[PDB]
Design a protein around this ligand. Structure first.
Ligand code: 3BV
Lengths: 244, 222, 240, 212, 195, 233, 235, 231
């Protein structure tokens, strides 16, 4: 029958590894680098677009950074189509929680449920896993500003600063060098860009090959604002830090 | 609107002795004021020295007897031809009846036989499965006529020893098969006189260690 | 639905998928359980290749199933969440129907049953996880420590360890633990647990987690400084 | 029916009548309305005869399965809650059951639970259930003290059923007595009202409404 | 089931609930506690159809306790009330709805404020300074309109509550066998034994 | 839940020494309207059984199809389909009796009263009744509807008990049936003059008589009847 | 790969045959039947000395009149026992009587072959089912994952089975007392066990008409071990 | 070779190997014999044991008062098929008040075994059956094979060394067919037939298993001291 053609996506190797999860991670390692840095008064999300063409519409484009709700956003590394499936689920899960408890969903709860979905694809169903790694950047009134990451295995962990996708090894060393705990947002903006500028496979880092976003308490009195940077706003912040 | 139940009349009677047990029932079948049959048996040998009758709505009665007879058959297959004891049969019947708790079998069921000590046994059931072992039970249309007579003559109720100032009760004792059949025949002739749905014929099934015997007697046909 | 029988027998009578799940446990960070006279202590390793971590929000290795029972593990982290969730639900379900919290034996038996079901169900692979379940039964002062594994077998232990280099720390416990006289106090029990982990860990900084469970739902997690004091004390006695 | 059970110094007393009716037709005078679930648990039956008899028999099978699985006798609380959760699933379907789960365990001590077919579950010291519950309450309450002796408690339970058996048209036949201690339940006989009424009238001097 | 009351004051929430359980012409019990603790700083009283009440209350209790274990965190009274309302709002369009009315009294530790929510069996939620279910309201609301002040103490609230129970005992047809009173504040939940 | 629309009235039958006789009129009524006149309500199954049906005609036609299909199904992989393993009356009845009770138990009955008449392989006479409720019974004489009230009394004067069966010839038995059909025409408002009759004998086999009529009627005395009491003209 | 319910060229089911190999790796279990009762004994086999041996539950009660011992992948036996207990209690509910030992065994064995592409694989555990009923008296059954069961006068399963079975062939007779049977299980267990036999690493049990199914204490078994050593030295 | 992985695959020469491998399981099974006259039908079966301490595996199963079979191969598969026959015999009784014909019993088994040989996932039955019965057309004997093929015979035998008993019956055909109104002599002929398949072992009291059905004889099985007459 059909047994002949089954890849058996949810099995162990003799060494106790999940073949498909490992190979999905190998896929993600070729994707455009995405960095998250958490400061005391906000969070930065920076991501490098995959080899841009000059005739690509840049201003009305979204590849790396996505908004889950008013208080939480994600940076993507891997297959975009796979990520969008998971993003719509996460958006719905956030609205279910709000409808139930009349309170915005805590960041970890959203992350756990999204990570639990990925886990399911590795243990049962016989389907391939999602070839996606997320960086979650968000705020709630329990833990404040938070950075998380999840990968195809469905395992998630918390971070002060983290990178996913390409050149994470080199990127994580640079972040570990210059990062400190009493850091501000504006400093973290500079660190994010400087790190990409050195780890990039491109000749020079320009405005048209980047996506940028901040989550500050920079609004008026005790409330959080999400800023997804416009092209011209990235051009200005790139000049202001002296990269171009 | 369609009504799934009907009344087929008739009446049944079970008495237990020391080493025997009888299960009697008239042979008349009716609907409203018409006679359907003057001889339609409703007391059945079900095997393993168990006799059974399910009086009331005959369609439900037949269905139940049919299912219990089948239950006995499968009991032999599943448990190495083991004899189904009267107490086990009763509990099984409860589950048959209660299985249709929310669309009941409209019948009064009575079974008879010998217990595991060889002594005579009679069990009786309501329509939804509640049961009880007794020395004595009448069921069906003329149950209300026959039952108090049985209390008096089988269990010696309200009878005291003469001259003892109503202080000493008449002592309980088992009845002979001869004496029991006398009481059955008198019970049914009396019920025939005063109940319209009872008559035509009487069929008694007697159960001893030797097997299952039958006796038949004519009843008034009006 | 996906039906494939993934866990099956081999010519030599082995179920490889179950045995390969044990290898995933062997890869996982070490975990240890030691029970004293009036307490149980759960110790856990944390690998130090991860700096720039946020320890406030990072999932803790020891999980509360109820107010009186805890569960630690070794193996795949994502898998462990599913078992913990099922256990926490069953814990509340038991209180609801029986009007009494679960015994540690019962909770273990349930978790072990779930693990077993995944070894002979179609379309699923076994859990790459072994657990140490510890606590105290309701209105009881006798300490309880149980272990489970992917195959589904479970058993009680005076002291036990699982994960990477667990055979080294089991060797340590086998000569250092006396059945006739277990650790009389909390301090003695925690020290023996930290000692056993120091055979394997590396540094006693932010690598060791300790959680103490006492009778009547009395559970607390130790901080860095409190654990570091045990590390400092043991090393000074060692130089002799 | 009339059934009662009350808690006191020396454990639990449980008393029931034995009548069964179908309208005004007295169908039986010899019904066993107490189920012996196990050596430490009793259950009383009032309402629909089949409903009570079937489900309390089913109940004893569930409790047997508990002690096989858990290697320990089931608690009175857990026992009563299995029954109450069962009937709650059938709520609205028309079950008619008024039951009392009575027993002793180490952790609980002597315990009585009232459980009925509309899902009510209540722990308590005194309960009377059935069509003649009010008649039993009248006698029981007015004579109840915690410090009753085993002998006096047994009699009060017996006398309360007799009172209801007399006045309530849908109660009678005979009285079945039980005493529950730390060591388990003890049966204290079947008492026919036919002889018991006159014996009580003469010796006690009560029932002056009746022609002697 | 009949009488359940609730009063929010300056620093606490006070719930009072009748002790009688009646069925037919018999008071089966006169010491019944018509409440369940959902969390350390949240208490829910209930009244309605026999069976439905306890079954519903415990089902909510189990769910909130499950949440507490999972997140190692206590839900706010506002969050708990919204969860309860949704469960009742589902229920009303079911095959057999829960016929239960509830009061949720809790102390929000983040805001340092007491909160009282009244929810009926339809899933109708309102936050109130004082609340009641059933026929009780027809006496107690007008009484509290007159005597209630927002800045009252817990002791002043208990006297205000005694004034309600007295009125009910005078004018209600049924004997409800007194009330069990419980207080919810910054230090948790405790029962007044002598009322 | 049904209500019967097009309906058929009485079916009557009895036993005699060597076999059984059954009869039923050829009318399909639509309430008070005597709508259809060519309706055959006796349906033979093989050469040894006749099924007579009263009640709803749409449900009768459904039952016809079931019996027709039963004969087909029995012939499948059956070399002795016209011999030892042929359909018996008792088999045909029990099948119908099963269906009738299953349909009543689903609250969707076949609104009929049925009488299965025939002869078994060992020569024994077979006659048994079944209706919408699944109720079954057997008797030397059987009848449905008005037949139960008017025919049975007349037929029981010939065969009152079991011992009267050997003493009753086919000539005497048919005479009683034909007489009963006349009485039903006098007194049943939903009956017709035309009817069918079937005899199943253990020796001569199945004889099916169509297009019979009620005859030798007494109507002459009507001319003498005037008014309703005190009229003289 | 290949189908789960496939036949070999010799006419055997691959998966069933492979499961039998798993059972050979399991710890030893022995059963002996007498006119005075049936005895069941097992090797506990703790993997490490720190493991509390009393928590090793390889002898199990099904009903008051039926007991059970296991060998192989013991985790697989949980759902088999659960089924056996339900079957036993359910039959008591439907028929107000104890269920026959043979009928119980047959109900368990019906689960065995309910696998394929139902559960994903056969059971990797063999069971010894011992009990008593009024009809056929004291009985001992061996239930395999093939769906087959044989009644036995005596039977050993597990790693030391073939060696122990040969010993049971010589030692068993129809007039064995219960005490004689107890010692005989201990004797044969001590012969095939790796580590030295004592009350902590071996467990005894029996079923009698009078007292029903009982697992022996470690104190009671210890005395039977001491009684066994003395009797062998006495000649 | 490459065409025996499952039952859904044909070989290049048009063979179903999984069905053939199931047939092989029957050859390994213990011998059983079937024969009949015009009045009675008899089953004789050699039971097999694990060792001297074990019981002897029961080979004969009752299906109805007038029908039953003997097995050879996988015993659990015989339990499944016999159970199906019991239900079909029972359906015929409840619905049609009719004893199920032995020929229809064969047709039903054939069609049940066939479905297992044409679908992916399932497997063929691994057992052969000898069905005897007495119905409205007299005594009958059937042979069932898990390929689906059912055959009506005067006499036959299946299992290991069944060729010896099958040859004997082929010689004795004219003799035993006319054993009418004599049960014991028809059994004697069946016992002498199965004896032609014995090697090193002989028929003992707890080894032999006999069953009979006929005109005025319900289906009954004889074991233990009840077969000592025929040794
Ligand atoms: C006191 C004595 C009365 O309230 C107790 O409460 C007892 C409890 C004991 C028996 C455990 N209750 C009864 O006796 C109970 C009262 C009752 C009756 C019906 C419904 C609810 C409560 N009686 C019964 O259950 C009788 C017992 C029989 C007669 C031994 N059973 C019936 O009346 C049955 C079943 C009724 C039924 C319930 C639910 C669904 C369908 C049916 N019905 C009949 O027997 C019908 N009838 C009897 C008279 O003869 C014609 C047929």
């Amino acid at each position: 029958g059909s047994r002949r053609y089954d890849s058996r996506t949810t099995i162990f190797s003799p060494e106790g590894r999940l073949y498909q999860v490992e190979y999905a991670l190998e896929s993600i390692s070729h994707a455009g680098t995405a960095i998250g840095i958490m400061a005391s008064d906000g969070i930065v999300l920076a991501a490098e677009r995959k080899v841009t063409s000059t005739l690509l519409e840049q201003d009305t484009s979204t590849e790396k950074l996505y908004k889950l709700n008013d208080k939480i956003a994600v940076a993507v590394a891997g297959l975009t189509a796979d990520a969008e499936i998971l993003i719509n689920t996460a958006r719905i899960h956030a609205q279910n929680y709000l409808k139930t408890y009349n309170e915005d969903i805590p960041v970890e709860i959203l992350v756990r449920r999204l990570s639990d979905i990925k886990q399911g694809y590795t243990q049962h169903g016989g389907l391939r896993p999602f070839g996606v790694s997320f960086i979650y950047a968000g705020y709630d009134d329990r833990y404040g500003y938070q950075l998380y990451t999840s990968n195809p295995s469905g395992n998630y962990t918390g971070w002060k600063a983290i990178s996913v996708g390409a050149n994470t090894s080199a990127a994580q060393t640079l972040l570990q060098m210059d990062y400190k705990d009493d850091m501000k947002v504006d400093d973290a903006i500079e660190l994010a860009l400087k790190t990409l500028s050195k780890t990039t496979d491109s000749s020079a880092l320009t405005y048209d090959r980047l996506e940028f976003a901040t989550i500050r308490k920079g609004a008026n009195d005790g409330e959080v604002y999400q800023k997804i940077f416009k092209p011209q706003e990235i051009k200005d912040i790139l000049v202001k830090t002296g990269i171009t | 609107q369609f009504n799934p139940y009907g009344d087929n009349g008739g009446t049944i009677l079970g008495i237990a002795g020391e080493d025997f047990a009888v299960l009697a029932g008239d042979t008349r079948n009716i609907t409203d004021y018409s006679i359907n049959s003057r001889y339609e048996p409703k007391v059945f040998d079900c095997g393993d020295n168990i006799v059974m009758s399910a009086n009331g709505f005959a369609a439900d009665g037949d269905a139940l007897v049919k299912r219990f007879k089948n239950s006995v058959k499968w009991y032999h297959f599943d448990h190495n031809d083991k004899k189904l004891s009267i107490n086990s049969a009763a509990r099984n019947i409860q589950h048959l009846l209660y299985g249709k708790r929310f669309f009941p079998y409209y019948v009064h069921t009575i079974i008879a036989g010998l217990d595991e000590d060889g002594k005579g046994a009679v069990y009786s059931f309501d329509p939804v499965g509640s049961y009880e072992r007794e020395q004595c039970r009448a069921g069906g249309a003329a149950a209300s006529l026959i039952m108090p007579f049985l209390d008096n003559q089988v269990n010696f109720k309200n009878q005291y020893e003469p001259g003892t100032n109503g202080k000493v009760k008449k002592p309980l004792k088992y009845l002979s098969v001869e004496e029991v059949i006398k009481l059955v025949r008198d019970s049914f002739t009396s019920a025939t006189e005063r109940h319209i749905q009872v008559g035509d014929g009487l069929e008694i099934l007697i159960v001893t260690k030797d097997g299952v015997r039958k006796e038949f007697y004519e009843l008034k046909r009006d | 639905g996906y039906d494939r029988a993934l866990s099956i027998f081999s010519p030599d009578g082995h179920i490889f998928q179950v045995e390969y799940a044990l290898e995933a446990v062997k890869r996982g960070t070490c975990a240890v359980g030691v029970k004293g006279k009036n307490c149980v202590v759960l110790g856990c390793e944390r690998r130090s290749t991860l700096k720039l971590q946020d320890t406030r929000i990072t999932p803790s290795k020891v999980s509360k199933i109820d107010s009186h029972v805890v569960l630690s593990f070794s193996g795949l982290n994502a898998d462990s969440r599913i078992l913990i969730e099922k256990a926490r639900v069953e814990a509340q379900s038991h209180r609801l129907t029986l009007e009494d919290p679960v015994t540690v034996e019962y909770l273990t038996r349930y978790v072990a049953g779930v693990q077993q079901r995944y070894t002979q169900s179609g379309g699923v692979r076994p859990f790459g996880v072994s657990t140490l379940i510890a606590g105290f039964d309701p209105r009881d002062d006798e300490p309880k420590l149980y272990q489970t594994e992917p195959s589904g077998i479970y058993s009680s232990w005076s002291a036990q360890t699982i994960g990477r280099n667990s055979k080294t720390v089991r060797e340590f416990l086998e000569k250092n633990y006396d059945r006739k006289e277990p650790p009389a106090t909390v301090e003695e029990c925690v020290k023996l647990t930290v000692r056993s982990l120091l055979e394997v860990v590396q540094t006693g900084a932010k690598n060791i987690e300790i959680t103490v469970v006492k009778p009547d739902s009395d559970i607390v997690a130790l901080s860095s400084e409190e654990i570091n004091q045990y590390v400092t004390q043991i090393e000074q006695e060692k130089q002799e | 029916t009339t059934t009662l059970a009350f808690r006191f110094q020396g454990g639990i007393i449980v008393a029931v009548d034995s009548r069964a009716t179908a309208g005004n037709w007295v169908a039986s005078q010899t019904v066993k309305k107490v189920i012996e679930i196990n050596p430490f648990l009793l259950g009383t039956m009032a309402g629909g005869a089949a409903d009570c008899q079937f489900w309390e028999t089913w109940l004893g099978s569930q409790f047997r399965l508990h002690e096989l699985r858990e290697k320990e006798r089931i608690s009175v609380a857990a026992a009563s809650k299995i029954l109450s959760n069962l009937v709650y699933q059938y709520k609205g379907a028309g079950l008619s059951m008024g039951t009392m789960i009575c027993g002793y365990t180490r952790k609980e001590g002597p315990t009585i639970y009232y459980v009925d077919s509309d899902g009510t579950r209540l722990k308590g010291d005194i309960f009377c259930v059935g069509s003649g519950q009010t008649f039993a309450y009248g006698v029981l309450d007015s004579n109840y003290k915690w410090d009753l002796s085993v002998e006096d408690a047994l009699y009060l339970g017996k006398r309360s059923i007799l009172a209801a058996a007399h006045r309530d048209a849908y109660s009678g036949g005979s009285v079945n007595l039980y005493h529950v201690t730390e060591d388990g339940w003890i049966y204290h006989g079947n008492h026919d009202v036919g002889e018991l009424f006159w014996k009580v009238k003469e010796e006690e001097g009560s029932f002056n409404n009746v022609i002697g | 089931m009949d009488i359940i009351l609730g009063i929010r004051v300056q620093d606490s929430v006070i719930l009072a609930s009748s002790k009688a359980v009646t069925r037919g012409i018999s008071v089966l019990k006169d010491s019944d506690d018509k409440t369940r603790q959902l969390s350390p700083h949240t208490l829910m009283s209930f009244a309605g159809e026999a069976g439905d009440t306890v079954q519903f209350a415990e089902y909510i209790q189990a769910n909130i306790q499950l949440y507490s274990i999972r997140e190692d965190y206590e839900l706010s009274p506002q969050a708990v009330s919204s969860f309860v309302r949704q469960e009742l709002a589902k229920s009303i369009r079911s095959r057999r709805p829960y016929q239960v009315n509830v009061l949720i009294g809790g102390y929000d530790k983040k805001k340092n404020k007491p909160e009282l929510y009244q929810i009926d069996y339809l899933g109708t939620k309102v936050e109130l300074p004082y609340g009641a279910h059933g026929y009780s309201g027809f006496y107690t609301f007008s009484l509290l309109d007159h005597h209630y002040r927002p800045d009252m103490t817990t002791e002043e609230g208990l006297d205000l509550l005694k004034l309600c129970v007295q009125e009910l005992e005078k004018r209600m047809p049924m004997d409800f066998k007194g009330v069990i009173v419980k207080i919810v504040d910054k230090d948790g939940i405790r029962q007044v034994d002598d009322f | 839940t049904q209500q019967p629309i097009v309906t058929g009235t009485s079916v009557i039958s009895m036993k005699y020494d060597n076999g059984v006789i059954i009869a039923a009129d050829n009318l399909g009524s639509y309430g008070s309207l005597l709508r259809f006149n060519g309706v055959e309500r006796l349906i033979p199954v093989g050469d040894n059984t006749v099924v007579g049906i009263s009640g709803d005609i749409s449900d009768m036609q459904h039952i016809e199809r079931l019996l027709k299909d039963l004969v087909t199904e029995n012939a499948y992989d059956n070399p002795l389909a016209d011999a030892e393993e042929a359909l018996e009356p008792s088999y045909i009845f029990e099948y119908l009796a099963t269906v009738m009770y299953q349909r009543r138990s689903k609250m969707n009955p076949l609104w009929n009263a049925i009488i299965v008449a025939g002869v078994q392989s060992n020569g024994d006479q077979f006659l048994r009744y079944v209706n919408l409720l699944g109720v079954t019974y057997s008797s030397p004489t059987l009848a449905t509807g008005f037949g139960a009230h008017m025919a049975n009394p007349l037929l029981r004067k010939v065969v009152d008990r079991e011992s009267d069966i050997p003493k009753t010839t086919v000539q005497v038995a048919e005479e009683a049936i034909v007489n009963a059909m006349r009485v039903l025409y006098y007194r049943d408002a939903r009956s017709s003059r035309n009817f069918s009759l079937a005899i199943i004998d253990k020796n001569t086999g199945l004889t099916f008589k169509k297009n019979l009529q009620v005859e030798n009627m007494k109507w002459d005395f009507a001319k003498d009847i005037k008014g309703y009491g005190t009229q003289k003209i | 790969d290949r189908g789960v319910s496939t036949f070999s060229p010799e006419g055997r089911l691959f998966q069933v045959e492979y499961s039998l190999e798993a059972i050979k790796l399991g710890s030893t279990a022995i059963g002996i039947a007498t006119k005075e009762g049936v005895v069941l004994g097992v090797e506990k086999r703790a993997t490490s000395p720190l493991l509390e041996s009393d928590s090793i539950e390889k002898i199990v009660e099904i009903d008051r009149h039926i007991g059970c011992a296991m060998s192989g992948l013991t985790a697989d036996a949980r759902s088999m026992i659960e089924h056996a207990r339900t079957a036993a209690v359910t039959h008591n509910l439907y028929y107000d009587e104890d269920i026959n030992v043979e009928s119980l065994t047959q109900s368990v064995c019906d689960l065995a072959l309910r696998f394929g592409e139902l559960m994903s694989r056969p059971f990797g555990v063999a069971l010894l089912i011992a009990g008593h009923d009024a009809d056929d008296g004291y009985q001992l059954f061996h239930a395999e994952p093939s769906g087959t069961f044989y009644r036995y006068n005596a039977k050993a399963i597990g790693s030391g089975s073939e060696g122990a079975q040969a010993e049971l062939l010589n030692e068993w007779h129809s007039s064995l007392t219960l005490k004689e049977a107890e010692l005989l299980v201990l004797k044969i267990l001590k012969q095939v066990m790796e580590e030295k036999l004592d009350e902590n690493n071996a467990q005894l049990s029996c079923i009698t008409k009078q007292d029903g199914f009982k697992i022996y204490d470690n104190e009671k078994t210890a005395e039977l071990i001491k009684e066994l050593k003395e009797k062998e030295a006495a000649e | 070779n490459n065409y025996d992985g499952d039952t859904v695959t044909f070989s290049p020469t048009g063979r179903l190997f999984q069905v053939e491998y199931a047939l092989e399981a029957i050859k390994q099974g213990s011998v059983t014999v079937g024969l009949r006259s015009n009045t009675h039908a008899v089953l004789v079966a050699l039971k097999r044991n694990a060792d001297e301490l074990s019981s002897y595996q029961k080979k004969i199963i009752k299906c109805d008062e007038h029908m039953g079979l003997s097995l050879a191969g996988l015993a659990p598969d015989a339990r499944v098929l016999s159970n199906y026959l019991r239900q079909q015999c029972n359906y015929s009784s409840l619905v049609f008040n009719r004893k199920l014909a032995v020929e229809r019993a064969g047709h039903l088994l054939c069609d049940k075994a066939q479905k297992n040989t044409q679908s992916y996932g399932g497997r063929p039955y691994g057992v052969g059956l000898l069905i005897i019965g007495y119905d409205k057309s007299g005594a009958h004997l059937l042979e069932f094979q898990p390929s689906g093929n059912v055959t009506e015979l005067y006499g036959t035998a299946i299992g290991a060394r069944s060729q010896g008993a099958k040859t004997y019956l082929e010689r004795t055909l004219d003799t035993f067919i006319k054993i009418d109104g004599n049960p014991d002599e028809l059994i004697k002929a069946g016992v002498e037939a199965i004896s032609q398949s014995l090697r090193d072992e002989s028929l003992t009291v707890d080894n032999l298993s006999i069953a009979i059905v006929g005109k005025d004889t319900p289906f009954t099985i004889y074991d233990g001291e009840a077969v000592a007459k025929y040794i």
